[PDB]
């Protein structure tokens, strides 16, 4: 199936970010998708997410692991620009400004093997 960037045009994505940030100024707009070809981890039902500004990557990883109903022992990586974040205590509002895409979304992919 097509990725989010392939299902929505660039100009549609830009406009959506502008409008959703007006409506929810304390939330960060995040696209979360399963890594291409990943089979151990399941698919999320939705693609577009709103994350409160204060949530850090450690907390977000916990949230997503719970949403996927993962076992505590199994590997899981949340990749922002193809790599795991090591500064897991910084709030996502700060991650957003450094790592957002050209379209204004913050893109994440999750995988089960070597980040």
């Amino acid at each position: 199936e097509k990725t989010f960037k392939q299902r929505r045009t660039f100009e549609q994505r830009v406009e959506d970010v502008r409008l959703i940030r007006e409506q929810h100024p304390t939330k960060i707009p995040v696209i979360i998708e399963r890594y291409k070809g990943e089979k151990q981890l399941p698919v999320l039902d939705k693609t577009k997410f709103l994350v409160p500004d204060h949530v850090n990557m450690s907390e977000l990883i916990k949230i997503i692991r719970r949403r996927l109903q993962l076992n505590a022992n199994q590997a899981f990586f949340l990749l922002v620009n193809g790599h795991s974040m090591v500064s897991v205590s910084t709030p996502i509002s700060e991650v957003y400004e450094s790592e957002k895409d050209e379209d204004g979304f913050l893109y994440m992919v999750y995988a089960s093997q070597e980040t």
Binding site: P29, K46, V51, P52, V55
Partner: peptide
């Protein structure tokens, strides 16, 4: 098509 958002907290 699905334009909705899920809130993560």
């Amino acid at each position: 098509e699905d334009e909705t958002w899920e809130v993560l907290e």
